[PDB]
Design a protein around this ligand. Structure first.
Ligand SMILES: [Mg+2]
Ligand SMILES: [Mg+2]
Ligand SMILES: [Mg+2]
Ligand SMILES: [Mg+2]
Ligand SMILES: [Mg+2]
Ligand SMILES: [Mg+2]
Ligand SMILES: [Mg+2]
Ligand SMILES: [Mg+2]
Ligand SMILES: [Mg+2]
Ligand SMILES: [Mg+2]
Ligand SMILES: [Mg+2]
Ligand SMILES: [Mg+2]
Ligand SMILES: [Mg+2]
Ligand SMILES: [Mg+2]
Ligand SMILES: [Mg+2]
Ligand SMILES: [Mg+2]
Ligand SMILES: [Mg+2]
Ligand SMILES: [Mg+2]
Ligand SMILES: [Mg+2]
Ligand SMILES: [Mg+2]
Ligand SMILES: [Mg+2]
Ligand SMILES: [Mg+2]
Ligand SMILES: [Mg+2]
Ligand SMILES: [Mg+2]
Ligand SMILES: [Mg+2]
Lengths: 68, 141, 59, 145, 70, 46, 64, 187, 75
RNA sequence: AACGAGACUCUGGCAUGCUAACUAGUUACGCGACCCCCGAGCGGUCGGCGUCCCCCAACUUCUUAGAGGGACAAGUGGCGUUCAGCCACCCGAGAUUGAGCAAUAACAGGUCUGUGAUGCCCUUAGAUGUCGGGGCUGCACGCGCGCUACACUGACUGGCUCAGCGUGUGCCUACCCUACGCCGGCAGGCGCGGGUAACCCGUUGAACCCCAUUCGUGAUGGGGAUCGGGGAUUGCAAUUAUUCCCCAUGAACGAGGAAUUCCCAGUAAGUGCGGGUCAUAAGCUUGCGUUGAUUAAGUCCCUGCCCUUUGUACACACCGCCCG
């Protein structure tokens, strides 16, 4: 199966959130474009994975705060 | 009716009788001692095979112009069983296909094409359409 | 173009192979113009190892 | 229909009238399928009959066409002994002349002691096949003393 | 001879469903779309199965030649 | 034949054969006794 | 030695038993009084909800 | 009928699966009624996708076996076709009910596993009951018409008939009875 | 193998029995008629085509690999 | 913190959205023409068939190939220390295509017969550096990879109707792919053209499969070994038959002992087609399509692999060591 993200994806998503916290929402097709415009991801698959982990983190930051 | 609107296996059967009902379409002399292709083992069962193959060649020329001997011999080519070794594809017999096309020209049914090859005449399209209509009206298709 | 060779000299080992291949791309352009202007425009800005062939009558 | 005598004794060989003619006369040597079909077509007799349905005025015609083929327009490229090595004839050798011709050909070869005769004498393979791993008629050899 | 029967049978359905959605009403096409897609898919949606490539060391994509110790 | 000029007296029966078809290039073999590698039943030495 | 047949419905899949992992432990009720339950070893591809037929229902499965 | 496909001729309503276990694993009627036992059929994709397959296409698939029959399915549809007509003549009952009864009469419900010649008895899942029934019914027709003058279509109908009319004269019912006897010994 | 000595053509006894079986058989195929009598099986085809011509049996299916008849579409 | 995994590259699946095409097409009618009434009708007008001919017609659906798009466990329900994640489902072209590349450390693995890579030793004019002839193919026997079969879910004879990946005129080196006419039963021959190729062979009329005949459980019309006689082609030369064609002869074999190999979906198996070697030539291998199942969704029993704890008289490492 898989679907376990790698440290290169998780660290990128954590930095993207920790800097542009107020531009990111709850839908995936907008976070994709935001991360596309604020960073430089040298692939499209990596862009989708980073933007998909950003959404899963945002859905949690609306609850109690995460520890990273 | 058109030729494409009727079952072709009955069309060939009717056209074979049409051809072997006139007395024309002079057959070769070696009709009883010929194997019909390299990849065969016996002579054709049907004694009057030349009229069936003439009808088949004519209905094939109705469907594609400019056919010529080198394609009739590909249209009748099949599989050859090389005894103990694997099988392969094989051509028909140039002599048979050439004599069939020459015997059809002897009926004003076909003519040599403008580009090299053979083609139906206007008089041949009519003879095929009449037999198509006859077959269609017979079986009430 | 494809060439599939054995990977080893000498014929020993597991029987692996290598698959090399070259790819040739081709395009054509058609113009209706005097030949002088054609030689004017076709002989400028040819950077890579692309071919450029000019034929005087094809239509 | 017409349970009449079926077992035929054609020249030096037994035919069973229980089979179709084109496959019954192949029981004779020198007569295969491709030959028998032509011999039956030239003789104008039917081809859906069992071999017992032939009265004594058909079998005779069939065999006299089977033995003198070039008379009845059977071609040359179709006969089993062409340009006969010692007489220049064209013929189908049929029933017992077949074994005699074969033995005469083997003896001719062995006489001048050509190579084919020497392979026929030693009971080996006459064409160019490998004999290291095929044929294999004898018994197993023991390696432990 | 058999991959073309399915092509024809899918194409004429894909045609009648497209003609009903451009020159007729919308419900008049979504009725026949459901009538077709309930009895059987592959009447409107093609299937992506394709042949797989042969690899060296076997007569096909997955089979291997016979191993032989001793 | 590769080492030796074996002699032949030409007879009117050999007309149209090859002269090479009358002196063989090898000895017709008579077998010995099978040696150490001849079967899987045989391997061992000290 | 004389017992009728008993149909039993599967309500839980426990695990794969046997040397090759070739059969499955399954808990069943008895189609007549749901207050009964036993554990059996089934040979085929059993889902949850299927109905098994028992030629001998007074037995119970230990393992293997 | 304009909305009810039969088989061309064989109506698929009024056919009763008289088992409570084997239904939901025999797809005869009311949603799996189709004109021919031939679909694209990506049924070997997930675990239980196989039970949704029509039963006549589960027999057509299994009948083409032993080497020089693989992929020859248009030859294996005409076999089932010619056999259903033979069945309708010899008996008179709807040929699908004979097939259902034959599938029921020939799937074993007890069987035995080699364990630790030690065997231990176990009970058969319904899907495996259907699979074993189909395999046994096809092997009987295969072995019956291997060197006979009878055809593969006469012997398939013979098998189906002797199985639906439980008689022990069919290969499938002899085999079922052996597996259940051998399993009863190892109980 | 075995020895199946079938008859290549009929005799009068078998020939009358072949017409006295017509109302009896629900399924008629060449193989069944081969197994009932001792018939060469390629004679059974001709016998059934002859019986069909005389309206004595009814054709329910004909195919290259199979032919099926039944008794007069009755019972 | 670094390498390997992953990311990455090629490939298969989707776009009626973009870009744009007589070396690709569609539709339209300009058409024109053939043919049949097959329909109303008359046969005409309307239609029906066309790889029959045209368009400086309109377009890109099918073909081509570029740019972008699109899938992320994103949505919903369960299970999760509510974390990492797992199962199911809606929507969808798709919710798990297939390959390429690949680490530290090592093996007395293979290659001196790929090399104008190479150390040392040997030979060097009676040569271990060139022409003619023979061998590498010889046959009591043991073994490995494979081809064809053991027939009726078949063989034979006719009829019908569908592909994809490729290659194609050679410099030294002299040979390429073929259309179409004629001649010959056949292999093959003669004569005239096209193609350095989306242009010609070619709309690649492939085989299995499909539809009808004959056979009838008999080593039979299953099988095609072995052998006789004749005819062609390549080549400087065919005998120890190079390859091909024709008539004839018609062996074992009726599903295979103990053992043992490969395989999860467009996959196994059946089936044919190209490339490689190739003056001549595939039962080999390397790719391509075509028909298309049964069985699994597991386990550690057998054979092995990875990580932890433990024991050791081993370290040439259990194929070890070692006692009388
Ligand atoms: Mg394959
Ligand atoms: Mg660290
Ligand atoms: Mg969730
Ligand atoms: Mg859906
Ligand atoms: Mg992958
Ligand atoms: Mg490595
Ligand atoms: Mg080296
Ligand atoms: Mg050296
Ligand atoms: Mg070498
Ligand atoms: Mg030299
Ligand atoms: Mg030399
Ligand atoms: Mg060698
Ligand atoms: Mg090998
Ligand atoms: Mg055929
Ligand atoms: Mg085969
Ligand atoms: Mg090949
Ligand atoms: Mg070539
Ligand atoms: Mg080749
Ligand atoms: Mg090789
Ligand atoms: Mg193994
Ligand atoms: Mg591990
Ligand atoms: Mg330790
Ligand atoms: Mg030590
Ligand atoms: Mg030890
Ligand atoms: Mg000692």
């Amino acid at each position: 199966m898989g679907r376990v993200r790698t440290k290169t994806v998780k660290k990128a998503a954590r930095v993207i959130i920790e800097k542009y916290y107020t531009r990111l929402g709850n839908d995936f097709h907008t976070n994709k474009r935001v991360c596309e415009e604020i960073a430089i991801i040298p692939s499209k698959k990596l862009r989708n994975k980073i933007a998909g982990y950003v959404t899963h983190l945002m859905k949690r930051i609306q609850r109690g705060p995460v520890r990273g | 009716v058109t030729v494409k609107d009727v079952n072709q296996q009955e069309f060939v059967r009717a056209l074979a009788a049409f051809l072997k009902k006139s007395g024309k379409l002079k057959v070769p002399e070696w009709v009883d001692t010929v194997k019909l292709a390299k990849h065969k083992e016996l002579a054709p069962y049907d004694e009057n095979w030349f009229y069936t193959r003439a009808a088949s060649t004519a209905r094939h020329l109705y469907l594609r112009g400019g056919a010529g001997v080198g394609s009739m011999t590909k249209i009748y080519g099949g599989r050859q069983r090389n005894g103990v070794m694997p099988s392969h594809f094989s051509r028909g017999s140039k002599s048979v296909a050439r004599r069939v096309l020459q015997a059809l020209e002897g009926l004003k049914m076909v003519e040599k094409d403008q580009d090299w090859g053979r083609k139906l005449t206007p008089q041949g399209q009519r003879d095929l359409d009449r037999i198509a209509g006859q077959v269609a009206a017979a079986k009430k298709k | 173009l494809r060439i599939t060779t054995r990977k080893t000299p000498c014929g020993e080992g597991s029987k692996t192979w290598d698959r090399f291949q070259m790819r040739i791309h081709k395009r054509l352009i058609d113009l209706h113009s005097p030949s002088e202007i054609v030689k004017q425009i076709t002989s400028i800005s040819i950077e890579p190892g692309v071919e450029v062939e000019v034929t005087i009558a094809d239509a | 229909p017409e349970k009449f005598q079926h077992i035929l004794r054609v020249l030096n060989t037994n035919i069973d009238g229980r089979r179709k003619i084109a496959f019954a006369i192949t029981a004779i040597k020198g007569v295969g399928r491709r030959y028998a079909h032509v011999v039956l077509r030239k003789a104008d007799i039917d081809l859906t009959k069992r071999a017992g349905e032939l009265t004594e005025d058909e079998v005779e015609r069939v065999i006299t066409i089977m033995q003198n083929p070039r008379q009845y327009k059977i071609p040359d490229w179709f006969l089993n002994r062409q340009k006969d090595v010692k007489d220049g004839k064209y013929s189908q050798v049929l029933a017992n002349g077949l074994d005699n011709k074969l033995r005469e050909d083997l003896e001719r070869l062995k006489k001048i002691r050509a190579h084919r005769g020497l392979r026929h004498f030693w009971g080996l393979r006459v064409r160019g096949q490998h004999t290291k791993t095929t044929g294999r008629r004898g018994r197993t050899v023991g390696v432990s003393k | 001879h058999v991959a073309q029967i399915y092509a024809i049978r899918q194409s004429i359905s894909k045609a009648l469903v497209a003609y009903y959605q451009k020159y007729v009403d919308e419900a008049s096409k979504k009725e026949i779309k459901d009538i077709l897609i309930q009895y059987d898919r592959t009447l409107l949606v093609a299937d992506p199965r394709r042949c797989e490539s042969k690899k060296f060391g076997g007569p096909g994509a997955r089979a291997r030649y016979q191993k032989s110790y001793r | 034949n590769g080492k030796t000029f074996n002699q032949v007296e030409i007879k009117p029966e050999m007309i149209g054969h090859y002269l090479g078809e009358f002196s063989i290039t090898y000895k017709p073999v008579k077998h010995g006794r099978p040696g150490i590698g001849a079967t899987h039943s045989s391997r061992f030495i000290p | 030695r004389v017992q009728p047949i008993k149909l039993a419905r599967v309500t839980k899949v426990l695990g794969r038993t046997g040397s090759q992992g070739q059969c499955t432990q399954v808990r069943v009720e008895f189609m007549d009084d749901t207050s009964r339950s036993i554990i059996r070893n089934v040979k085929g591809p059993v889902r949850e909800g299927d109905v098994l037929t028992l030629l001998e229902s007074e037995r119970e499965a230990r393992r293997l | 009928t304009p909305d009810i496909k039969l088989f061309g001729k064989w109506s698929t309503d009024d056919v009763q699966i008289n088992d409570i276990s084997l239904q939901d694993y025999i797809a005869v009627k009311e949603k799996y009624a189709k004109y021919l036992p031939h679909s694209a059929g990506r049924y070997a994709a997930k675990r239980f996708r196989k039970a949704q397959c029509p039963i006549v296409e589960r027999l057509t698939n299994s009948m083409m076996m032993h080497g020089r029959n693989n992929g020859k399915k248009l030859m294996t549809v005409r076999i089932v076709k010619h056999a259903f007509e033979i069945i309708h003549l010899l008996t008179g009952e709807n040929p699908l009910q004979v097939l259902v009864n034959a599938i029921i009469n020939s799937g074993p419900r007890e069987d035995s596993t080699r364990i630790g010649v030690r065997r231990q008895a176990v009970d058969v899942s319904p899907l495996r009951r259907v699979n074993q029934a189909i395999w046994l019914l096809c092997t009987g027709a295969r072995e019956a018409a291997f060197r006979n003058i009878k055809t593969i279509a006469e012997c398939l109908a013979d098998e189906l008939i002797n199985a639906a009319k439980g008689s022990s004269n069919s290969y499938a019912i002899k085999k079922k009875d052996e597996l259940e006897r051998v399993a009863k010994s190892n109980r | 193998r075995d020895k199946l000595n079938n008859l290549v053509l009929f005799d009068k006894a078998t020939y009358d029995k072949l017409c006295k079986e017509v109302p009896n058989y629900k399924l008629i195929t060449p193989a069944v008629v081969s197994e009932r009598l001792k018939i060469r099986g390629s004679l059974a085809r001709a016998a059934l085509q002859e019986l069909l011509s005389k309206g004595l049996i009814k054709l329910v299916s004909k195919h290259r690999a199979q032919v099926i008849y039944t008794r007069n579409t009755k019972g």
